[PDB]
Design a protein around this ligand. Structure first.
Ligand SMILES: *[C@@H]1O[C@H](CO)[C@@H](O[C@@H]2O[C@H](CO)[C@@H](O)[C@H](O)[C@H]2NC(C)=O)[C@H](O)[C@H]1NC(C)=O
Ligand SMILES: *[C@@H]1O[C@H](CO)[C@@H](O[C@@H]2O[C@H](CO)[C@@H](O)[C@H](O)[C@H]2NC(C)=O)[C@H](O)[C@H]1NC(C)=O
Ligand SMILES: *[C@@H]1O[C@H](CO)[C@@H](O[C@@H]2O[C@H](CO)[C@@H](O)[C@H](O)[C@H]2NC(C)=O)[C@H](O)[C@H]1NC(C)=O
Ligand SMILES: *[C@@H]1O[C@H](CO)[C@@H](O[C@@H]2O[C@H](CO)[C@@H](O)[C@H](O)[C@H]2NC(C)=O)[C@H](O)[C@H]1NC(C)=O
Ligand SMILES: *[C@@H]1O[C@H](CO)[C@@H](O[C@@H]2O[C@H](CO)[C@@H](O)[C@H](O)[C@H]2NC(C)=O)[C@H](O)[C@H]1NC(C)=O
Ligand SMILES: *[C@@H]1O[C@H](CO)[C@@H](O)[C@H](O)[C@H]1NC(C)=O
Lengths: 170, 50, 106
């Protein structure tokens, strides 16, 4: 609040304008980064009420209706595990809207595969989508269909191990 | 206002139904990428001292 | 990476201190619902599509490519056999045509 200090500071020119401009550029760059990473879909996809995916369990990654934040258990664990003229500007996208974007991406990739990323979302059964992914890596569809229960059990076990590993590693 | 992310689109998922495209659109999009800047040189002695 | 949709080609254009890429991409449109099955049960054998997918318009079963609707008759030439019908979940019963059958029939 010193007037004499500000009068002497005016002799140095537009240094303060340069610093404010650089900080403003950084602040808008963070919002641009968040838009580029998370806002890649213009349709908010939602999962069907019946979670019949051929044995595949997505409860640990889909949003929990019981939680007010509408986050997944994994996302909730991630949020729990992360802890003089200065101002902190809030981010343009809040955490619930970012969670909504991730939920839309999860619903699109579960119900439609990769179709929603290239155009209109085309529905496909999840085992058939998994078979398509198997064909992408050079394994025939029959292997996926014959061992579907084993693949679903392994996927559920791996997702549980991921949650345990995140909860158990500082 | 509170901003809206996108229009809601509930995909009609079921265990035995598929959606197959019957037509296509040839879409051309633009992507602008900067490559270079203006090459500026400053004579340090002449700038500071003339 | 090269536009929204399935990338077909791209064209470069010069710009002041920059480049403009015209990405020509393929976008699916006018999609239609069909009833689908993982495999076709015929003669106690499971048939799977070699490159496409089994679709049904309500009464008849066909095999088509995944990104465009082009229904074709389910034959032995566009399907392959792996195992019986007891393992695959959701296998349906349908006939599988043999192109060689009218040749020895005549
Ligand atoms: C999907 O997985 C979830 C979590 O692994 C299962 O939820 C569990 O259900 C059992 C039995 O009802 C409970 O004892 C556990 O406490 C539940 N876990 C959690 C984290 O709530 C769920 O049953 C699985 N299957 C389906 C169809 O959702
Ligand atoms: C494929 O079938 C589904 C289910 O019959 C259609 O989904 C419904 O479409 C109507 C028409 O607008 C909506 O009012 C319903 O809300 C939709 N249901 C759900 C669960 O989203 C779907 O439109 C059909 N697709 C085509 C291309 O005909
Ligand atoms: C696929 O969509 C194209 C649109 O690009 C359709 O072409 C149009 O067909 C109508 C009907 O005669 C014409 O009046 C338009 O002039 C056509 N547009 C162009 C750009 O040629 C085409 O008919 C559609 N095909 C199917 C099978 O649905
Ligand atoms: C599904 O497609 C098949 C193939 O086009 C349809 O079968 C044809 O139906 C027409 C109209 O009744 C007949 O004139 C043709 O002779 C049929 N072809 C054969 C090989 O039988 C079938 O009707 C379609 N089903 C539905 C529900 O649209
Ligand atoms: C598809 O065909 C198979 C084989 O013809 C059917 O399996 C038969 O089902 C009847 C009734 O349950 C049994 O009595 C036979 O012993 C079964 N045969 C075999 C070889 O398993 C099957 O039910 C048919 N499915 C449909 C939907 O028609
Ligand atoms: C789809 O689910 C229904 C029950 O909702 C079941 O009767 C049917 O057999 C299932 N079909 C496949 C292919 O999983």
């Amino acid at each position: 609040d010193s007037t004499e200090c500000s009068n002497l500071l005016l002799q140095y020119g537009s240094f303060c304008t340069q610093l404010n401009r650089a900080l403003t550029g950084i602040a808008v760059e963070q919002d641009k980064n968040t838009q580029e990473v998370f806002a890649q879909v213009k349709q908010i996809y939602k999962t069907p009420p019946i979670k019949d995916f051929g044995g595949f369990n997505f409860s640990q990654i889909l949003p929990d209706p019981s939680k007010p934040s509408k986050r997944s258990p994994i996302e909730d664990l991630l949020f729990n595990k992360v802890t003089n003229g200065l101002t902190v500007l809030p981010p343009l996208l809040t955490d619930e809207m970012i969670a909504q974007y991730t939920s839309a991406l999860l619903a699109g990739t579960i119900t439609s595969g990769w179709t929603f990323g290239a155009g209109p979302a085309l529905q496909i059964p999840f085992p058939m989508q998994m078979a398509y992914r198997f064909n992408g890596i050079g394994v025939t569809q029959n292997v996926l269909y014959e061992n579907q229960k084993l693949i679903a059990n392994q996927f559920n076990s791996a997702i549980g191990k991921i949650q345990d590993s995140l909860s158990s590693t500082p | 206002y509170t901003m809206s992310l996108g229009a809601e689109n509930s995909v009609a998922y079921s265990n035995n139904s598929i959606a197959i495209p019957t037509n296509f659109t040839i879409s051309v999009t633009t992507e602008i990428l900067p490559v270079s800047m203006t090459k500026t040189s400053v004579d340090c002695t002449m700038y500071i001292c003339g | 990476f090269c536009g929204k949709g399935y990338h077909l080609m791209s064209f470069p254009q010069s710009a002041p201190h920059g480049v403009v890429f015209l990405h020509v991409t393929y976008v699916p449109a006018q999609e239609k619902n069909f009833t689908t099955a993982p495999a076709i049960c015929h003669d106690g054998k499971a048939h799977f599509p070699r490159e496409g997918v089994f679709v049904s318009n309500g009464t008849h079963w066909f095999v088509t490519q995944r990104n465009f609707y082009e229904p074709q008759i389910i034959t032995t030439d566009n399907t392959f056999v792996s195992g019986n019908c007891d393992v695959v979940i959701g296998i349906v019963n349908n006939t599988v045509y043999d192109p060689l059958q009218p040749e020895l029939d005549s």
